[model samples]
Structure formats: structure tokens, C-alpha cells
Target chain A: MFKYKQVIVARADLKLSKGKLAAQVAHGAVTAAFEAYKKKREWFEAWFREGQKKVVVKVESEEELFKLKAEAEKLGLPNALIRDAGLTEIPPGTVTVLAVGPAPEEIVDKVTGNLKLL
Target chain B: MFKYKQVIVARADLKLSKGKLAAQVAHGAVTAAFEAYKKKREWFEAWFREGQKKVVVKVESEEELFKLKAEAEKLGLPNALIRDAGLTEIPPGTVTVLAVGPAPEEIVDKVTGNLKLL
Candidate 1:
């Protein structure tokens, strides 16, 4: 079983094209991993060496994303909320996805466990 | 204009579901960023400070992905090729996406310029 993982929580209602969704989720993951590297180096190294396990989940709205973000923050998890650049599918500054933790799996699940797979 | 960025090349022919695609791209990105951090610290820092620009493009097949990977490697760009863990949509070890550069935009584009936005 994997002890460390990352969670990518996407906003399904955005209706982003496949490529757009992938890019946004990629940004979220990299940003959060950077946060973990700076704030929790051990978690970052463990997750990286453990194959960098990542799970993608879906939320219906931006509100749901921020709520999960709040939970993650309260629990002191490393997280990132991604905003699109408006170069393509969505408008500028659109909050697209939230990435939570390259931390312990159980802790990450506490922030994102209820969401369905994207 | 952004001077530094990253590129994610996904296999569109794989017909991955949206969630699966997002997860694969995420893995590719974080892996490649780690690669840059170790091998090219300045590129990583400049990219991270420059908003971590990422472009997602589509490739038609596995051969195409590897071809681009070869191109990137030949040019000395930091890159990562991601394979699935088989926990969900695809089988184990299915190569899904290639991530290139948290490097100079011009150089990253040289390897991925011909590809279309996914």
C-alpha cells in the first residue's frame, strides 16, 4: 500500500477541453509539490521516491474546491489552487483545480476523500 | 510574455477518461520539475517564479511521444515520461504522457512546437 500521495481536485463544471483540464491539473500538482518541498521536505522526498502517487478527483463547483482548500489549510497540508491564464478555453483568473498534498495518504484523504473520480 | 515554461505531451489516441488524463499529466509534470530542480536549478527557479507556465499538447501515438522525448533529450531539456500505475482506467505501465521542461520557452517549444493544443 502507498503511504504517501497527492490529490488533484478538478472543477468538473468548468467543462474545460481535455487538454485544458490536463494542463490545469498539472500546474496544481507541480505547485503543491513545490510547497511541500519548501515546507515539508520529508513528505516531498518520501512521496517522490514512492513513485509520486497521485489521485484525481472531481468537484462540481468552485465553492466545493475552496471548501476543501479550507479544510486542507486548517489541517496544515501543502496545497495549490490553480487559476487559468485565459489563453484558451477559460477566462482569465478562473480557479480551475486544487491540488492537495504530496503528504501522508490518510491526511490527504481527509481533505479530498469524499470527491468522486474526475 | 512568459520567458520560461513547461510542456506536457499527452497521447490523445489513448482515449483516456478526463480524470485519468489529468492524473497522468500531473505525474509527468511533477516528475519533470523534480528533474529540473536537480539538473537545472536556475531553469526551475525561473520557471517557478515566472508563474510556471505549462502548455498541454496532444500526440497521436506512443511512437510520437517517444519521438518528441528523443528530441527533448537530444536538446538537453529536462523531461519526464509517465506510465500509469494501473489502478484505474488503463493497464499497468501504459505510457500516457511526456513532460518537457521547466526551461526556456523557446527551447521547450522547439521540441513541442508542431503539436496542437489538446
Candidate 2:
């Protein structure tokens, strides 16, 4: 089992296009990886060595997303929200996805364990 | 300017759901990063320090995706293709996305420069 990983919380209600959805999550994973790269380098390294396992969870609304983000932040986990520039899929400043980790699986799961896979 | 990054080439012909699309792209990014981490750690470090920038590109079909992947492989750039386990959205073994880099931007762009953003 992978100990270090990243979890991306993507909006389930949006029902975005394949391209748009992928782009947003791509942003989340990279943005959070950068966060961990700076703030949790060892965890990032362990994640890297373990094939950089990433899990994408589904959140039905912004409220659920925010609650999890706050939980992760309280734990000081490396996290990032993926907001759109309104270029294609959604309106400007729309938060499309949230990323958390390169931290231990237990820590991330504590906040996201109950969410469904996207 | 970012010197290093990862690029995910997702198929445009297949209009997957937001969740499925995002998950595939996430897989591509992490897979390519791990590839780079094993074979090009310095480049990976530079990329991670520089924000782990990821750009998602669009391709029309399997032929197009494979062409780009071959080009990237010919350059010996780190690359990986995201194949579906046939668990949900698509049928078994459907190649959904192609990941390239965490190598130098110049090298990655050589193969993917002409593609449109996803």
C-alpha cells in the first residue's frame, strides 16, 4: 500500500466536458505537488518514489469541498484549490477542484475518506 | 518562465465525464512524474520547485495520441499513457490520455507544440 499520496476533490455536480475536467484536475495535482515540494519535501519524495499515487474524489457541492480543505489546512497538509480562469469550461474565478497531499495516506483520508471516487 | 513541466494529452474524440476525465489526467501527470523521478530526478526537482506546471492538450483520436507518444519516446523523454482498466466510463484497455515530461519544456514542446489545450 502507498503511504504517501495526493487526493484531488473534483466537483461532481459540474458534469464538465472530458477536456475541461481533466485540465482542472491536472492543475490541482500539480499545484498541490508544488505545495508539498516546498513544504513537505520528504513526503513528496516518498510519494514520488512510490509512483506518485493520486486519488480523485467526488464532492457534490462547494460546502463539502471547503470543509475538507479546512480540515486539511488545520492539519497543515499541503493543499491547493484549482480555480478556473474562465477561459473555456466555467466562469471566471470558479473553483473547479481541490488538491491535498503528498502527505501520509491516513492524514489525507481523515478528511476525505468518506468521499466517492470521481 | 517555467523551464520544466508535465503535459497531459487527452483524447478529444471521447467525451468522458468530468470525473473520469479528471482522474485520467491525474494518472498521467503522476505516472509521468514518477517516470521522471526515477530516470530524471534533477529535472523532476527543477519542475517541482518551479510549481509542477501541467498543461493538458487535446488530440482527436487514438492515431493522433499514439503519434505524439511515439515522438516523445523517440526523444527518450519520460512519457506514459493512461489506459482505462475498463472499470467505469470506457471499455477495457481504452487508451484515454498520454503524459509527457517533467523533462525540459523545450524537449516536451518539440513533440506536443502543435496540439490544442484540453
Candidate 3:
């Protein structure tokens, strides 16, 4: 069983087009993985070596996204918030998704377990 | 103006659930970015410095993806093909997406220019 994983939390309220949603998800994943590499190298290495276990989940709104982010922080997990560049579908600076972890699976679950999949 | 970018090519035929789609996109993004950093450091740095510009486009099927990948190879572009782990949505080893570049935009466009946004 994998001990480490990452959870990508996206906002369902935004109604982002498929392509745009994928872009934001990629941004969040890449950015938060970078954070994990920097701040939690052991977790990052374990997850990477274990095939980068990842799950994509959803929050109903941006408020829920931020709340999860705060919980992730309070728990000391590496996290990232993705804001759109405004080059296409949405306005600039819209928070689209949050990536939590690449941390121990149990720890990450504590923050994202209740959310549903995207 | 940014001269470099990355393009993510997804397959419409797979009909991945949105979250599954997002996870695969991220896998492609991270994997190809790593390839770019390793093999084409200058292009990777330029794209990263330009705020990591990226676009998501679509192809009709797996055959189209491999064809464009061939073209990408011919053009010396960095690319990564994503295979799903089959944990939930798709079967294991299914090729869900392709990420090309973080290289010169014009070079990437040669392979992906005709594709539509996802």
C-alpha cells in the first residue's frame, strides 16, 4: 500500500471549461509538488518513488477550497493555491484550485477525506 | 511576449471523468516539465520565467496522439505521455494525455496547431 499521496481539490462552482479546468489542476499539482520538494523532501521522494500517488477531489466553492487550504496549513502539509492567468476563459487572479500534499496518506486524508471526487 | 510554452493534448475518446481528467493532465504536465528541464534546460527556463504559459488542446483518439507525438519527436520537442494507473476511472496503462514542450511555441504549434481546445 502507498503511504504517501497528493490530493488536488478543485472548485465545482467555477464551471470552468474542461480545458481550463485541466490547466488549473496542472498548475496546482505542479506548484504544490514543488512546495513538497522544497519543504517536505522525504514525503516528496517517497511519493515520487511510489509512482506519485494522486487523487482529484472537489469542493463546492472557493470558500471550501480555502478552508481546506487553511486546514492543510495548520496541519503542516505542503500546499499550493492556483490562480488563473486570465489569458483565456476566466478573469486574472481567480483562485481555481488547491493542491495539498504529496505527504503521508493518512495526514493528507485528514485534510481532504470528506471531499468528493471531481 | 512569451516565446515559449507548453501544450497538453488530451484524448476525447477516453471520456475521462473531470477529476480523472485533471489528474492525468497534471501527470503529463509534471512528467514533461521534468523531461524539459533535463533535456532542454534553456527552453524550460525561458517558459518557466515567462510564468509557465500552457494551453490544453484535444485530439480525437489515441492514434492522433501518437501521430502528433511522432511529429513532436521529429521537431525535437520535449513531450510526455501519461498512462493512468487504473485505480478508479480508467484501466491501468491507458494513455490519457500527452504533454509537449515548455519549448519554443512555434515549434510546438507545428505539431498541435490544428487541434482544438479541450
Candidate 4:
């Protein structure tokens, strides 16, 4: 079965308190990514990474990819930071793609089948 | 290091369009799960399962477990479905627990360290 993944590239200087950071990420970052994802028409999956400098969200379609990308851009993330993680299609299953600021360069590594943060 | 996990037991007959289902699950189901998790005092983690009959959420504490269970019940889920999955304490990290209809029989499998769906 194929699974979806999202990668976030947050600003190095984000200073929200841990709790605040989480809330914003959930509401701002995650929401943005999800919106972008839905616009592309994709199945929703699970989020991957948690609280850290970087987080990875996961979704299951091209719509999700675009939704997340658009949201990231709206967040004022740098263009270099926004990148496609990878693609995997699962029949009747959803993949989650995490959208973060400054998209990563290589979302997924073909060899390891793991998402790269860039 | 410890990771959090949430287990969900959704009604077998949810009838939203796949997109609607996904959105509800994301907003209704997952949001409920997260709210429950935060109330208890745990770090946020990632969600596990994708679009399918069942999904597993991950979080990092007892608070999340209670919150998820409470939300599931509020959503009119049966009591039998709501059950504790398991516990793995990670310092400064998060564990996600998927909250579904009825709590699963077992949340975590001690042997494999993998989440068990009831």
C-alpha cells in the first residue's frame, strides 16, 4: 500500500511559544497545507512529524499537493523552501502530504522511499 | 525516545462523500482527537492511518487519550469502542493516539510496540 507524506520548512526564526507554535502550525501551517491539498482533489491521510524545527504532513493526492503548496506560499515562505515531496497512489486509500513554509528541495527520496526535509 | 499513538474506531457506516468523509474526519474526527489530546497535557505527534475503514492517530500523553475518548463518546460513539490503547512515555516528545467510534480493545501491543486496532 502507498502512503502520503507532507514536509514542512519553517522559518529558522519562528518564535512562537511551544504551545503557540503548535497551535499556529495546526491552524496556520497544517490548515494551509490541507486547503491546498483539497483544492487538488486528494484523499486525506495522516501527519508525519511532530514538534521540532521541521514537521511533515501527509495527504493522498495531487489536489492536496497544490493546496499545501499554495498555503505555504501564502504563509510567506520562501520559494526555495516549497518543493514536492513525492507521489504514491493507493487505490481506495488516502495519502497525507505535509505543507510547510519554504518547501523542501526533495520531498521524497526515490531510493529510501522516505520523505526528505531539505 | 517515546512516540505517541491514537487509535480510532469509526462507525462502520459513515456515508459522507469520500471528500466530505475526509474533511469531517479531518475536522470532526481528527480535531476532536487533538482537542482531547491537548486537554490532557501531551506533546503533539503525527497521525498514522490514512483513508480506509480505520485510522490511527498518534499523540504523546494520557491527556490526549482522555480527550479523544471523550470526543468520540460525544460524537455518539458506543462505549465499547472507546478503550485505552497503551502508553509509551517519551521525554520532550509526543505520541499520537487515534480516537475513533468505540475505543479499541487494546491500544498498544506490548510485544511488537506497534499499535493494535480493536
Candidate 5:
């Protein structure tokens, strides 16, 4: 069983292109995974070993997106936020997606469990 | 300077939704990072240290996608392929993305250098 996993919390309102959205999600995962590797090696190890499962969930707008990531910080779960570099679909500096966990599934689900998959 | 990175090659022809595409990309990164964590821990360590740099790139079709992953495999770089579960935009078993590396940029670039950022 995958006890450790990562969840990508994205803003569904932005409506990014397939390619650009994929880019932002990749950014979130890579960024947060790094934070976990540095600060919580055991969780990182179990996550990587147990198939590196990730869930892509969505919030309706930027406000909801930030709200959850902020909660993640308050909970001390590893998190990362993605801002687009203005090269593509949206605009420069658009807050696109958030990466949380590589921590316990239950802990991450406590914050993001209600959200729909993106 | 960031000396390590991951590259995600997504299929442009699939025309996936932002949410679906993001999920596939996250799957690729997490999948490949785990493979690197197991088979090439040094690359994983250095990559995590360097901010976990990642680029999402695109290919026109699945053939081009497989061509590149095959070359990546031949080159001994860590890579993972993502097939959608048919829950949303694409059909089941769609090869939506390919994840390569967390390896030295020189080695990764040697294979993916010609691709354009997605």
C-alpha cells in the first residue's frame, strides 16, 4: 500500500492548455518533492519506494487554491506553489497549481479530500 | 547553477483537458523520480538539492514520444511512461506523457535537448 503520496492542488478557473497545465503540475511535484527530500527523508523514501503515487485535485479559483496550501503550511506538510512564467496560455505570474505532500495519505487527504480531481 | 533536472514529454495530439493533462504529468514526474531514487540515488540527491528543476516539453504523436523514451532508456537515464485511466478526457491506456531524468543536465539534455518546452 502507498502510505506516502503527493497531491497537486490546481486552480480549475485558469483553464490552461494541456501542455501548459502539464508543465505547471510538473513544477509543483518536482518542487515539493525536493522540499520533502531535504526536510523529511523517511517520508520521501517511503513515497518513492511505494510507487510515487500522486493525485491531481482542483479548487475553483486562486483563493481556494491558496487557502489549502496555506493550510498545508500550518499543518507542516511540505507544499509548493506554481506561478506561470508568462510564456504560454495564461499570463505572466499567474498562480496555477499547488503541490502538497509526499507525506502521509491521510494527512494530505485531510486537507484536500473534499476536492474534485482536476 | 542548477545542474540536474527532469523533462516531461507530453503528446500534443491528445488534446487533453488541463486537469487530465496535469494529472498525467504529475504521474510521470513522481514515477520517474522514484525510479531514480532506487537506481540512481546520487542523481536523485543532487536533483533534489538543485530545486528539482523540471521542464514539460511536447511531441506531435505517440511514435515520436516512444522514440525519445527508447533513446532515453538506451542512454541509461531514468524514465517513466504515463497511460491515462480513461476516467476523463482521454480514453483508457492513452500514453499521455513520458518522464525522463532527475539526472545530470548534460546527460538528459543530450537526449531531450532538441525538444521544445511545452
Candidate 6:
């Protein structure tokens, strides 16, 4: 099974303004790369941060990544982008942790693979 | 939010033969309709049955239906087919049931959408 995961980052300042943020996330320039792709719903999951400016979402496929990016643009958060952490691409049975905001920054340092903070 | 679900059916005799069955499910003439669509993971879930010869998969989008159909064909279960149960297409927050084989065939009767037993 080839599973894909997406991580979306946003500022905590824009969490409450979801409608604006959603619009921003949907139409932002950064999400244009994935517009041609379809979205996956199985692995689609989102997290919000009120104090932080970043939001990370984990998805199952590249298609879902595009959907998340567009959603971020719609939310008015232009900074959201997808990073390849090599989490879902590994062989089946592999386990990974997707830490949202409020985790110890050091934990972010301990992980391997690509890491992007928007 | 709009959601999609797929139900795949096969013969009880083919359950013990998975690879052959998967392939049968993948390439059998029935799944050709969804070849052009994409698949979803967030709502994708599968179940197998050996004695019943039937398998039903639940997905979140029309695209996922295509992917599942391909997977079923790959499994060599040519009888595998996608049926529109109308589960995920309604408004978000709605809940529906997807009953695989081994259930009372009567439960299948209570269901109000498309039903296929291949």
C-alpha cells in the first residue's frame, strides 16, 4: 500500500478566522502547484492552533495535499505549504509521529526526513 | 462536506484465494467504469471474507471508488464491482452503515441505496 501524508502549517493568529483563512489557504499562490491534483479523504486530517501561526495536516496522498493547500488558502493563511516528510512513502507497517503545535520544539529536531515550518 | 462510499461483491468461493481474488477483483470486466477517477484515503476502509465470497470497501470520494475498483481487480477477484450506496454523498456530519458479508442478508434489505452482489 503506498500511503501519502501531508503537513499544513499556519499561524496561530489566523485560527479563529477560519472562513477567511480557508479562502486564503484555498487560493494562495503556494497552493497553485497542486491545483491539478485530486484530493483524498481517507487520510485527510487537520489541526488548528490559536496561539501559533502554523497548522499542520496529515493526509494519505499527494492529491489530498493539494486539497489541504487549497483549503489553507481559503482560510486566508497564505503561508501553508506541503513538505515531504517521507512518513507515508515508507514500506507498510512503518510508524511515524505527526506533532502539531505546542510540542517541545526539540521534538521537531529529533525527527528525520523533511521538515517545513510555514 | 461531501463523502463517497463503494461496496464490492464477490463469490464466497474466491475468498481463500486472495492474490487470485485481488487480481480478479482488479481486472474483471466490472470495474472498468471507474478507471478514470482518483481514490481517497481518509474514508477508505476494506474488509475481507473467506466463506462468503464477498468484499465491500468504503471510501470517501468517487475517486476512491476508482482506486478500490483497481485494487479489487488487482486482487484477481474479477467479480468485484462498485455500487453507489449513497452513503458519503449527503451533507457532512451524516452517518451511514456499510455491512459486508456474514451479516444477515436481511440487513442488506434494510439498506436504501444501490446494492450489488457479484
Q: Which TM-score values does chain B get in all models? A: 0.95, 0.95, 0.93, 0.33, 0.93, 0.27
State the lDDT of candidate 4 residue by residue for B28-64, as single tens digits.
2334343433542222323212211223333444464
lDDT of 3 by residue, A12-102 (tens): 8888778888888888887788789789999988898787877888887778888998999999999998876644566777788899999
- For candidate 1, write residues A10-42 as lDDT tens digits: 988988888888888988999999999999999
Expressed as tens digits, the lDDT of each residue in B11-94 for candidate 5 is 867876566667778878877887898899999988876657778888888888789889999999999987744345567666
Name the best candidate (by DockQ).
1
1 versus 2: better TM-score goes to = 1
Off by over 4 Å in 2: A86-89, B1-7, B11-20, B30-66, B73-96, B101-110, B113-118
After TM-score superposition, the amount by which residue B71's alpha carbon in candidate 2 deviates from its true location, in angstroms, is: 2.2
Q: Which digits, one per residue and each the tens of the lDDT, describe model 5 over residues A1-118?
A: 6688789987878776666667678888877887898888888889877756778888888888788888999988888988855344567777889999889999998889899987
What is the per-residue lDDT of model 1 for residues B55-105, given as tens digits with 9 covering 90 to 100?
889998989988999999999999999887744466777789999999999
RMSD of each: 1.7, 4.5, 1.9, 17.0, 4.2, 19.3
lDDT of 3: 0.85
Q: Rate the local accuracy (lDDT) of all candidates.
A: 0.90, 0.81, 0.85, 0.31, 0.82, 0.27
Best by TM-score: 1
DockQ, ranked from best to worst: 1, 3, 5, 2, 4, 6
Q: Residue-pair clashes per candidate, as listed?
A: 0, 0, 0, 55, 0, 72
TM-score of each: 0.93, 0.69, 0.91, 0.31, 0.72, 0.19
User: Measured against the native two-chain assembly using Cα atoms, what DockQ does each of the candidate structures obtain, in the order listed?
Assistant: 0.76, 0.39, 0.69, 0.05, 0.45, 0.01
Best by lDDT: 1
Q: Give the per-residue Cα lDDT of candidate 2 at A16.
A: 74
